[PDB]
TrEMBL record, chains A, B:
Compartment(s): Membrane
A Pfam family this chain is assigned to: Anoctamin_N
Protein name: Plasma membrane channel protein
Species for this entry: Fusarium vanettenii (strain ATCC MYA-4622 / CBS 123669 / FGSC 9596 / NRRL 45880 / 77-13-4)
Gene Ontology CC entries for this record: cortical endoplasmic reticulum; membrane
Length: 672, 672
């Protein structure tokens, strides 16, 4: 049930061929881990591999090593508070959490051996036989985590802080985003259920409140982000993180901030490379868009105007062409994206994975919303643009076969409600099946398809089971939540119950993804991020586009429920987009004047640092001091200008100025 | 030529009536200035007033007093660098400038007597007889200032830093804004002269480059602002400035930043009062707009469709109705604005004068551009909307008098070029006459309309001359430059030579306003501001509106040079406004990656503070330390868990793990 004090486990895959190099690589690996001070073990792993088991040996050297990371964080302004002057008394004040313990151990195996650590990384290709380094789960905590989170209706903030201490910050930012998303989704569930019942379908008032809500949630989350970044001591860790070994520096220069020499790429040289991202995103709209629009041009052909026999066996024909093609074009375009991402030559390891997401966001934008963009902007408002597209499928279906039995085409206005019932109800049930029921049972189905001490027998059988699992990507669950936020901000005016059935989903997904860490994947390495990352631009882009395309839908679709004026679309676009930009200013003005406990905790600790530095260095009666200098300047010039100084030495003290002051007032009154 | 060491001069107006209170107020005034340590004098002032002459007496007490203001600035993060540990050695490193000297003396006469200073202020009404406190000019520097600035073609940055040391920062920010405006106006003068010569009038390409230029200049000025705010040590002085005595605090609470109790108004209570500003600005558009549009409806009536005799003597009739009415409605609306500004109850003294400008900006927006907004959006595109307005003036002119001789109305397209020739050429010549030639000669004409020691005779005649001048408002010259920037960003697509004749004007105005400080006004009190103030919103509003109304003009006016589609205006508005918002993101992304010497100088001094605080407190061989703990844990549990710890005590050292590691690999290969 409990681990044998193991922080990290290294797999070290050994093939039958090139074994002598793998033997020589083994003795180079195990010798390197003793230079950093890790007590090690070796056990029988899989059929051809050897799991080694490492832990930190001496706690007196480790507690000094954590203290340098505490001083190193406070040096670059990351930690808002300095540690105590006494060594290991600040460790008594705040103990070393499991996140900070596992992060520093992972550094000692991944530091590049120049300044510290032993460079055990798969990318260096000397340790090519090393598969992956991973920490072990604690089944005592994971059983207590899901049991505590299932009984409560809503999660307290101290529950997320329990996740930060165990699974790092980058995992804890997901649950802190999802809980702030699940609670803020009550508001468009409130009037959204009201706009479905009281108001009609496609109401302008709901599209104005949805655009108002999405900027309130986004600008409050940026305020809630800096409250957590200074609470967990993760304020601005983008400059901290260890640089990628593929960094191609032009020249080694001096860093003005740290005073320590760093590798430097010219930042304006990257921007001229970064402008290649714009033709990449434009080609991705053409590539993925032309797949979706013709598979939907086939889907409108089969279901409606094709009256041939057995269309239910033919209604599944276009969706097969999508699911065989939508990873194919994505597999091609991600191959171009990763070749483009190597060209931009990012410094830090997080910024390389961040810009990969920003390029992958264009693909996931097209594969999620182009079926809805085709319905609400081509099919239901216009329709007659599809008649050249519909006549093409009528021609080629005859060559597959008498005249093909067709019918006259009429625009069905219930398709936009029918497609939104799939994306918010049917897909979320399927996503609950394929993310929970599938990879849990497939892990048990792997158990059917398959010399040790009896005391460690169940433990080594547990760790060998844990090594087969895939490592957890927190970017994968961000993409499920941001794309779900796209359906609320953009297309929920068509189906105003979408915020309700997304609110029910997030209550499960906050516990479903919590279950996914425990039983479905190995424990991820406890990284640190100050923000959620590049999703803040993805949340802001869908919030702005959700102001335009929700006002365009309510104009184009409500006329079906007879000609629509072209300026009436452009005026309705211009007004609600300006209503978005106005209420973006008004909310950011109000939330600026609101009390922020994030920066106020920061600026107080910045102030009291300067007050402590000041006090250690510095540890009637005034009327004569005016006269005592007025007689001390006239003595040091009468030895020697004089027409200047005779203005001041005439009157000394206040009583000389009072009595000559009163004399001048009757001189001025009697002359008049 | 040179002053007699006088820092400040107090006027102290004395009337003939209530003289006994003014006598008792005099002895209360002169006694209060000796509590703070100011050496004083009394001289005969005007016909009924007494100029007193103050200076700081003892420099040993003053140099300690400046050092507290240097420590007080560095305490709240204003100064980026701490002063030296030795007293008066940091004064040797950087001397006390005339700005810092005159600011601290003005504080001692305006501090509210609770924590320091003597409360000599006219607003308290005990010192009602005090007219104004002002420092004296130095004619040696002012003659050298205009002579140096007339010979140079462009001003070096060290010339503006000479103004900061003498006239404070709030004056120096104007010349640092005007020089960054005069140099950035070369760029729309460059292609603007090109678009006038090569391209035709009302070109779309110039309207796209003008909107591109205005966001480049504005986002570079915000970058250049924080470079100057950390160079002169004015980084964020909004929290520093002394609160207004009219502050009506609800409750006295504790400040989290300083740890010192402050007066507190609830900030959300002010915002609910601040929403009254929106019906104020909407009423100001109706009030000032209805004056301008009917005086221009009269001006189109007299000049064009009225063929009566002597229209040149009647062509001056509508402009008389403007100049007698445009201060009348402004005098009424500023009376409502100042009664509204007292309602919002601002804390600091600068924020009260800042929000007064933001309310006055709506008046100066309407009195400057409504004549251009009426021409380009009512007269030249549509015209037939004016025929109800034109028929009203035709009816009432008959009642002033046979049928009145009229003619058929035709839209003259040269009026927009004729009105822009007034605003950029004729008004700037008149503004050069009324701001320079008028108040200089009127000061000499005051000299025609009009018992002392002979040695101070020309000096007291100089100071009595200086007391009659009005104090300099730097907000007045900001309004002349921001409204001029409105003609470039918004209406310069109609007359593309406007950036050229504004570039010639700013070369004079940078030396004209420099002359205006020296000979036309008394020296202003050296205040401090971190930014230019509320003009950054006024620059950003005209830059955004200049993207819309320049794209609307080029659509509506080029069709004259036959029907215009209504969507063609809305599409051309939507595209160039989106082109503004896109290039607002792209420039702010590029300028973020650019090297900023402002914040890099700040974060280095923040880092080296923490490095100095750290170092004063803190002032093969590793393979056995793994084994020495592995034998130190097995000794302290064999006295007594054991199935846990027996995993680790089996293998000690690296040579035990190597030899049992090699044994396991042939065990795994031979079994396969």
């Amino acid at each position: 049930e409990s681990n044998f004090g193991v922080d990290f486990v290294i797999h070290y895959k050994v093939p039958a061929a090139e074994r002598d190099e793998a033997e020589a690589g083994f003795v180079q690996l195990i010798r390197a881990l003793t230079t950093v001070g890790l007590a090690t073990e070796v056990r029988h792993g899989e059929n051809e591999s050897l799991l080694v088991f490492v832990k930190v040996a001496s706690p007196d050297l480790f507690a000094k090593q954590v203290y340098r990371a505490r001083l190193g964080d406070w040096l670059h302004g990351v930690r808002v508070s300095a540690p105590h002057n006494d060594i290991a008394q600040a460790l008594q004040d705040e103990p070393v959490v499991e996140a900070e313990r596992l992060r520093l151990i992972y550094l000692m195996i991944t530091k590049p051996h120049n300044e510290g650590g032993a460079g055990v990384t798969p990318t260096n290709a000397k340790w090519k036989h090393v598969e992956s380094i991973f920490p072990l789960h604690s089944h005592s905590f994971n059983k207590e985590w899901i049991k505590k989170w299932s009984s409560k209706y809503t999660l307290e903030q101290t529950d997320i802080d329990n996740i930060r201490d165990k699974f790092g910050e980058s995992v804890a930012f997901y649950f802190a985003f999802l809980r702030s998303y699940f609670r803020f989704l009550v508001i468009p569930s409130a009037f959204g259920f009201g706009a479905w019942l009281l108001l009609g379908q496609f109401s302008y008032l709901y599209a104005l409140l949805c655009g108002l809500w999405s900027v309130v949630f986004f600008e409050y989350w940026k305020k809630q982000e800096v409250d957590l970044a200074v609470q967990w001591g993760v304020r601005g860790v983008s400059s901290i993180q260890q640089s990628r070994p593929e960094f191609e520096w032009e020249h080694e220069a001096e860093d003005p901030i740290t005073g320590e020499p760093v590798k430097v790429y010219p930042p304006m040289k990257r921007v001229k490379t970064q402008l290649l991202q714009i033709p990449f995103a434009l080609a991705c709209v053409v590539a993925l868009g032309a797949l979706i629009v013709t598979c939907n041009s086939l889907e409108v052909f089969i279901n409606e105007v094709y009256s041939g026999p057995g269309k239910q066996y033919l209604g599944f024909l276009p969706t097969i062409f999508l699911v065989i093609g939508t990873p194919t074009i994505s597999g091609v375009l991600m191959g171009a994206a990763e070749k483009l991402n190597a060209m931009e030559n990012y410094a830090t390891v997080d910024a390389h994975d961040a810009a990969l997401i920003q390029k992958q966001f264009v693909l996931n934008f097209m594969t999620s919303y182009m079926a809805l963009f085709f319905t609400a902007f081509v099919y239901i408002p216009f329709g007659h643009i599809l008649h050249p597209f519909l006549n093409f499928w009528r021609a080629t279906a005859q060559t597959l076969t008498k005249e093909l039995p067709t019918r006259e085409f009429q625009i069905n206005p219930a398709r936009i409600s029918n497609q939104m019932f799939y994306f918010t109800v049917t897909a979320q049930i399927v996503n609950f099946a394929t993310e929970v029921v599938v990879p849990y049972i497939k892990q048990q189905a792997f158990q059917k398809a398959k010399e040790d001490h009896e005391e460690e027998a169940e433990f080594l059988q547990r760790v060998r089971e844990e090594c087969t699992l895939e490592e957890y990507d927190v970017s994968g669950d961000y993409r499920e939540m941001v794309m779900q936020f796209g359906y609320v901000a953009m297309f929920s005016v068509a189906w105003p119950l979408a915020a309700c059935c997304f609110l029910v989903n997030n209550w499960v997904e906050l516990r479903s993804d919590a279950l996914k860490i425990a039983i479905s994947s190995r424990r991820p390495i406890p990284w640190r991020t100050d923000s959620i990352g590049p999703w803040l631009t993805a949340l802001s882009f869908l919030s702005w586009l959700g102001s335009i395309t929700s006002s365009a839908i309510v104009y184009l679709c409500s006329n079906s429920k007879s000609p629509l004026k072209a300026w009436g679309l452009l005026l309705s676009i211009l007004f609600a987009e300006h209503f978005y930009l106005v209420v973006q200013l008004a909310v950011r003005f109000v939330l600026s004047k609101l009390d922020s406990p994030g920066l106020q905790k920061e600026r107080k600790e910045r102030f009291q640092t300067k007050k402590r530095l000041l006090q250690e260095n510095l540890g009637i009666e005034h009327s004569e001091k005016i006269t005592r200098e007025a007689l001390e300047e006239e003595a040091r010039q009468a030895s020697i200008g004089t027409p200047e100084e005779m203005f001041w030495q005439r009157q000394r003290g206040m009583q000389e100025t009072i009595e000559i002051g009163r004399r001048m007032i009757e001189q001025q009154l009697a002359a008049g």
